[PDB]
């Protein structure tokens, strides 16, 4: 049924949520370090 | 009928979960910047 | 009404509707026959309700799981074992108790007869009585014989 496929897509997006949070955390650490470096360099 | 409506509801749930993925990425982006001010305050001018 | 899980068909539920078209895959027939099944599917609750209890035939209640039916069968075997115990081994124990009670009643009757003899004769233990089960005319003949010593 189409309901099963839509539920599979929902599960995939739910996993992608946890994946994207962790992926963005590391990159945002770079932004935080950049703000700290600007404050220091001033 | 009921099967199609359930499929539409689960598709809406998938869209909501993807929106939550984007929101969590942006939330990490904002939260890493957040609370840095106190760390710089104790690290930079306190030193 | 009861213990219908033993005849279960194991999307479908234990209904056994005794005296359906939808987008859901109703093209199915459950094996819940001892009763009969109807075209239904779990994708739509409306179809299952219509095929089980919405109208016409009523859904028969069943034990929650087929494991409940198996446990009921095992408990039935254990109950039959206990009843057979009470009817054979406990019956033999009851027969032994009945024999012991008959022996005790005979001993008590002998003691009573000894007391009656001591009342009607010398105090030291001495009896010459007899015990039997004759007819009424037999009791009359016994009374005629023993009218010498009657109570």
Curated annotation (Swiss-Prot), chain B:
Disulfide bridge partners, by residue number? none
Q: Would you say which domain of life the source belongs to? A: Eukaryota
What this chain does, per the record?
Subunit of the peripheral V1 complex of vacuolar ATPase essential for assembly or catalytic function. V-ATPase is responsible for acidifying a variety of intracellular compartments in eukaryotic cells.
Q: How does it assemble?
A: V-ATPase is a heteromultimeric enzyme composed of a peripheral catalytic V1 complex (components A to H) attached to an integral membrane V0 proton pore complex (components: a, c, c', c'' and d).
* Family designation: Belongs to the V-ATPase E subunit family.
What is the protein's given name?
A: V-type proton ATPase subunit E
Q: Gene encoding it?
A: VATE
